[PDB]
CSV table of C-alpha atoms in Angstrom, one decimal:
chain,number,residue,atom,x,y,z
A,1,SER,CA,0.0,0.0,0.0
A,2,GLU,CA,1.3,3.4,-1.0
A,3,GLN,CA,2.0,5.7,1.9
A,4,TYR,CA,2.5,8.9,-0.1
A,5,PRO,CA,0.0,10.9,-2.2
A,6,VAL,CA,0.0,11.0,-6.0
A,7,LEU,CA,1.9,14.0,-7.3
A,8,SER,CA,0.6,16.6,-9.8
A,9,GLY,CA,1.6,15.5,-13.3
A,10,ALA,CA,1.8,11.8,-12.4
A,11,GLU,CA,-1.9,11.0,-12.8
A,12,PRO,CA,-3.0,8.2,-15.0
A,13,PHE,CA,-4.8,9.1,-18.3
A,14,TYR,CA,-7.9,7.5,-19.6
A,15,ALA,CA,-9.9,8.2,-22.8
A,16,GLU,CA,-13.0,6.3,-24.0
A,17,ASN,CA,-13.3,6.5,-27.8
A,18,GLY,CA,-13.5,3.8,-30.4
A,19,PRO,CA,-13.4,0.0,-30.1
A,20,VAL,CA,-9.6,-0.1,-30.8
A,21,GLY,CA,-7.5,0.5,-27.6
A,22,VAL,CA,-3.9,1.4,-26.8
A,23,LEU,CA,-2.3,0.7,-23.5
A,24,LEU,CA,0.7,2.9,-22.8
A,25,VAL,CA,3.3,2.0,-20.2
A,26,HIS,CA,5.8,4.4,-18.5
A,27,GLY,CA,9.2,3.5,-17.0
A,28,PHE,CA,11.3,2.8,-13.9
A,29,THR,CA,11.2,5.7,-11.5
A,30,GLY,CA,9.2,7.6,-14.1
A,31,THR,CA,5.5,8.7,-14.4
A,32,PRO,CA,2.8,8.8,-17.0
A,33,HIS,CA,4.4,12.2,-18.0
A,34,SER,CA,6.8,10.3,-20.4
A,35,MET,CA,3.9,8.7,-22.4
A,36,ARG,CA,1.3,11.5,-22.1
A,37,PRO,CA,2.0,13.2,-25.5
A,38,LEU,CA,1.6,9.8,-27.2
A,39,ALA,CA,-1.6,9.0,-25.3
A,40,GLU,CA,-3.1,12.3,-26.2
A,41,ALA,CA,-2.2,12.0,-29.9
A,42,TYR,CA,-3.7,8.5,-30.1
A,43,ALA,CA,-6.9,9.6,-28.2
A,44,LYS,CA,-7.3,12.5,-30.7
A,45,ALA,CA,-7.0,10.0,-33.6
A,46,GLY,CA,-10.0,8.2,-32.1
A,47,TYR,CA,-8.4,5.4,-30.1
A,48,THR,CA,-9.5,4.4,-26.6
A,49,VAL,CA,-6.5,5.0,-24.4
A,50,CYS,CA,-5.2,3.8,-21.1
A,51,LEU,CA,-2.1,5.2,-19.5
A,52,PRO,CA,-1.8,3.8,-16.0
A,53,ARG,CA,0.4,4.9,-13.1
A,54,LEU,CA,2.8,2.1,-12.0
A,55,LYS,CA,2.5,1.2,-8.3
A,56,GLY,CA,5.0,3.1,-6.2
A,57,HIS,CA,5.5,5.6,-9.0
A,58,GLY,CA,4.5,9.2,-9.0
A,59,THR,CA,4.3,9.3,-5.2
A,60,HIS,CA,7.7,8.9,-3.4
A,61,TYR,CA,10.7,6.7,-3.9
A,62,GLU,CA,10.1,5.2,-0.5
A,63,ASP,CA,6.9,3.8,-1.9
A,64,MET,CA,8.8,2.5,-4.9
A,65,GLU,CA,11.4,0.8,-2.6
A,66,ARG,CA,8.5,-1.2,-1.1
A,67,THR,CA,7.3,-2.5,-4.5
A,68,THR,CA,8.4,-5.6,-6.4
A,69,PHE,CA,8.2,-6.1,-10.2
A,70,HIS,CA,4.9,-8.0,-9.6
A,71,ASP,CA,3.3,-4.8,-8.5
A,72,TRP,CA,4.4,-3.0,-11.6
A,73,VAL,CA,3.1,-5.9,-13.7
A,74,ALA,CA,-0.2,-5.7,-11.8
A,75,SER,CA,-0.6,-2.0,-12.6
A,76,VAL,CA,-0.2,-2.7,-16.3
A,77,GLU,CA,-2.5,-5.7,-16.1
A,78,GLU,CA,-5.2,-3.4,-14.5
A,79,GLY,CA,-4.9,-1.2,-17.6
A,80,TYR,CA,-5.2,-4.2,-19.9
A,81,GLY,CA,-8.4,-5.2,-18.1
A,82,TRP,CA,-9.8,-1.7,-18.3
A,83,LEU,CA,-9.4,-1.9,-22.1
A,84,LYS,CA,-10.8,-5.4,-22.2
A,85,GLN,CA,-14.1,-4.1,-20.9
A,86,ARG,CA,-14.2,-1.6,-23.7
A,87,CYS,CA,-12.3,-2.7,-26.8
A,88,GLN,CA,-12.3,-5.4,-29.4
A,89,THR,CA,-8.7,-4.7,-30.3
A,90,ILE,CA,-5.8,-3.9,-28.0
A,91,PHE,CA,-2.3,-2.6,-28.7
A,92,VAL,CA,0.4,-2.0,-26.1
A,93,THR,CA,3.3,0.5,-26.2
A,94,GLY,CA,5.9,1.4,-23.6
A,95,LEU,CA,9.2,3.2,-22.9
A,96,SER,CA,12.2,1.5,-21.4
A,97,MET,CA,10.9,-0.7,-18.5
A,98,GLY,CA,7.6,0.2,-20.0
A,99,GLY,CA,8.8,-1.5,-23.1
A,100,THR,CA,9.9,-4.5,-20.9
A,101,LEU,CA,6.4,-4.6,-19.5
A,102,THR,CA,5.0,-4.4,-23.0
A,103,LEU,CA,6.9,-7.5,-24.0
A,104,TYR,CA,6.0,-9.2,-20.7
A,105,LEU,CA,2.3,-8.6,-21.4
A,106,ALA,CA,2.5,-10.0,-24.9
A,107,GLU,CA,4.2,-13.0,-23.4
A,108,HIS,CA,1.2,-13.7,-21.1
A,109,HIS,CA,-1.8,-12.8,-23.2
A,110,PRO,CA,-3.0,-14.4,-26.5
A,111,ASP,CA,-5.1,-11.5,-27.7
A,112,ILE,CA,-2.7,-8.5,-28.0
A,113,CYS,CA,-3.0,-7.2,-31.6
A,114,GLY,CA,0.5,-5.6,-31.7
A,115,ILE,CA,3.2,-4.1,-29.6
A,116,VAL,CA,5.4,-1.0,-29.8
A,117,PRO,CA,8.3,-1.2,-27.4
A,118,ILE,CA,10.5,1.9,-27.3
A,119,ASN,CA,14.1,1.4,-26.1
A,120,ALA,CA,12.8,-1.7,-24.2
A,121,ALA,CA,15.2,-3.1,-21.7
A,122,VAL,CA,15.9,-6.9,-21.6
A,123,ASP,CA,19.6,-7.0,-20.9
A,124,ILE,CA,21.7,-4.6,-18.8
A,125,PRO,CA,24.7,-6.6,-17.6
A,126,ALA,CA,25.9,-3.8,-15.2
A,127,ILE,CA,22.7,-4.1,-13.1
A,128,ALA,CA,22.8,-7.8,-12.2
A,129,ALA,CA,26.6,-7.5,-11.9
A,130,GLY,CA,26.2,-4.7,-9.3
A,131,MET,CA,23.4,-6.5,-7.4
A,132,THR,CA,25.6,-9.6,-6.8
A,133,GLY,CA,29.1,-8.1,-7.1
A,134,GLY,CA,31.3,-5.1,-6.8
A,135,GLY,CA,31.1,-3.1,-3.6
A,136,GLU,CA,28.2,-2.2,-1.4
A,137,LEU,CA,25.9,0.4,-3.0
A,138,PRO,CA,24.1,3.2,-1.1
A,139,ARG,CA,20.4,2.6,-0.2
A,140,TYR,CA,19.4,5.2,-2.7
A,141,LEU,CA,21.2,6.3,-5.9
A,142,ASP,CA,21.1,9.9,-7.0
A,143,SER,CA,19.4,10.8,-10.2
A,144,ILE,CA,21.3,13.4,-12.1
A,145,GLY,CA,18.8,13.8,-14.9
A,146,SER,CA,17.2,12.1,-17.9
A,147,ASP,CA,19.0,10.9,-21.0
A,148,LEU,CA,17.6,13.4,-23.5
A,149,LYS,CA,19.0,15.2,-26.5
A,150,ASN,CA,16.6,18.1,-26.0
A,151,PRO,CA,17.9,20.1,-23.1
A,152,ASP,CA,14.7,22.0,-22.4
A,153,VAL,CA,12.6,18.9,-21.5
A,154,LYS,CA,12.2,18.0,-17.8
A,155,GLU,CA,11.0,14.5,-17.3
A,156,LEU,CA,8.8,13.9,-14.2
A,157,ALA,CA,10.7,11.2,-12.3
A,158,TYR,CA,12.2,10.5,-8.9
A,159,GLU,CA,15.4,12.2,-7.8
A,160,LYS,CA,16.5,9.0,-6.2
A,161,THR,CA,16.5,5.4,-7.3
A,162,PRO,CA,16.1,2.8,-4.5
A,163,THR,CA,18.8,0.2,-5.0
A,164,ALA,CA,16.4,-2.5,-3.8
A,165,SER,CA,14.3,-1.7,-6.9
A,166,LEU,CA,17.2,-2.4,-9.2
A,167,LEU,CA,17.1,-6.1,-8.3
A,168,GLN,CA,13.3,-6.1,-9.1
A,169,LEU,CA,14.1,-4.6,-12.5
A,170,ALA,CA,16.8,-7.2,-13.1
A,171,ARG,CA,14.4,-10.1,-12.3
A,172,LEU,CA,11.7,-8.6,-14.6
A,173,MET,CA,14.2,-8.2,-17.5
A,174,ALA,CA,15.6,-11.8,-17.0
A,175,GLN,CA,12.1,-13.3,-17.0
A,176,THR,CA,10.9,-11.2,-19.9
A,177,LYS,CA,14.0,-12.1,-22.0
A,178,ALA,CA,13.6,-15.8,-21.3
A,179,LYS,CA,10.0,-15.8,-22.6
A,180,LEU,CA,10.5,-13.7,-25.8
A,181,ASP,CA,9.6,-16.7,-28.0
A,182,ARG,CA,6.0,-16.6,-26.7
A,183,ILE,CA,5.4,-13.3,-28.5
A,184,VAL,CA,3.6,-13.8,-31.8
A,185,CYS,CA,1.9,-10.5,-32.4
A,186,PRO,CA,3.2,-7.9,-34.8
A,187,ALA,CA,6.0,-5.7,-33.3
A,188,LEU,CA,7.2,-2.2,-34.1
A,189,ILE,CA,10.5,-1.8,-32.2
A,190,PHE,CA,11.9,1.7,-31.7
A,191,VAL,CA,15.6,2.0,-30.7
A,192,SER,CA,17.7,5.2,-30.3
A,193,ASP,CA,21.1,4.8,-32.1
A,194,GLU,CA,22.7,6.8,-29.3
A,195,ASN,CA,21.6,5.6,-25.9
A,196,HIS,CA,23.3,6.2,-22.6
A,197,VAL,CA,21.0,4.0,-20.5
A,198,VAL,CA,20.0,0.9,-22.4
A,199,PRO,CA,22.4,-0.6,-24.9
A,200,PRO,CA,20.7,-0.3,-28.3
A,201,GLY,CA,21.8,-4.0,-28.7
A,202,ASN,CA,18.7,-4.9,-26.7
A,203,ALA,CA,16.5,-4.2,-29.8
A,204,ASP,CA,18.2,-7.0,-31.7
A,205,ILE,CA,17.8,-9.4,-28.7
A,206,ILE,CA,14.1,-8.6,-28.9
A,207,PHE,CA,13.9,-8.8,-32.7
A,208,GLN,CA,15.6,-12.2,-32.8
A,209,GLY,CA,13.9,-13.6,-29.8
A,210,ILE,CA,10.2,-13.0,-30.6
A,211,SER,CA,8.2,-15.5,-32.7
A,212,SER,CA,6.3,-12.7,-34.5
A,213,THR,CA,5.9,-13.1,-38.3
A,214,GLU,CA,5.7,-9.3,-38.7
A,215,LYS,CA,8.4,-7.3,-37.0
A,216,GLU,CA,10.3,-4.1,-37.7
A,217,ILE,CA,12.9,-1.9,-36.3
A,218,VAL,CA,13.0,1.9,-36.5
A,219,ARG,CA,16.3,3.4,-35.5
A,220,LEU,CA,15.9,6.9,-34.1
A,221,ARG,CA,18.8,9.2,-35.0
A,222,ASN,CA,17.7,12.4,-33.2
A,223,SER,CA,16.9,11.1,-29.7
A,224,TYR,CA,18.6,9.6,-26.7
A,225,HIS,CA,16.9,7.1,-24.3
A,226,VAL,CA,13.8,9.1,-23.3
A,227,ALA,CA,12.7,9.2,-27.0
A,228,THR,CA,9.0,9.9,-26.3
A,229,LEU,CA,9.8,13.4,-25.1
A,230,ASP,CA,12.8,13.9,-27.4
A,231,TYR,CA,13.1,15.3,-31.0
A,232,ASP,CA,11.8,12.0,-32.6
A,233,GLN,CA,8.5,12.2,-30.8
A,234,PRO,CA,6.5,13.1,-34.0
A,235,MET,CA,7.9,10.1,-35.9
A,236,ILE,CA,7.2,7.7,-33.0
A,237,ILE,CA,3.6,9.0,-33.0
A,238,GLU,CA,3.2,8.9,-36.7
A,239,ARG,CA,4.7,5.4,-37.3
A,240,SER,CA,2.8,4.0,-34.3
A,241,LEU,CA,-0.5,5.3,-35.8
A,242,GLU,CA,0.4,3.7,-39.1
A,243,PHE,CA,1.1,0.5,-37.2
A,244,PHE,CA,-2.2,0.5,-35.4
A,245,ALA,CA,-4.1,1.2,-38.6
A,246,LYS,CA,-2.3,-1.6,-40.5
A,247,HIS,CA,-3.1,-4.3,-37.9
A,248,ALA,CA,-6.6,-3.3,-36.6
């Protein structure tokens, strides 16, 4: 149970429109802020939209510290269920760990129409390494800002990362990576060529691992990791809309 109140800007976003739905998943220590411009664009295009707030996110990092990856999965599952009550057709898109959760969801549901992971994380060796090796880490790691090309964007995210939450992320990534072959729905995979957080190599692990018969990669050349708020935002939105229309 969250002990801290939800912060302004971190609210989930819902829009009831047509029978085709899009689930949007934000990232680790992040908030719905990172996916909001996408959610709004898709809503305006006539899609039913669900952008949930991950448990322990958008409140306080102490809440986050208390969560496990199961809680984050449950938050996304709640959004899937909300769409299930309203939509004949469901797409899922997500940034970073949101992309990881997008893959995870496609691995455990048979009726997802398509996925759009954006810089999804499935293998970050430094993380598991540090959780089981190296020296003892502080309880909280200091955030020093978001990986963005555009300097004038401020992402709404925690100023500290609970180290305990890193193990949860590592477990989520490991279990998602192991089950990639269960994914059969069409996939549009975005990857930033320059990325200082997730190795772009992850996109290939995903591309090769999934069983999808229709899969594509779009390499973004004008964005860093937080691409949804970076210069390539218009392309991400446009290509995603084309993807939704192609498969619905």
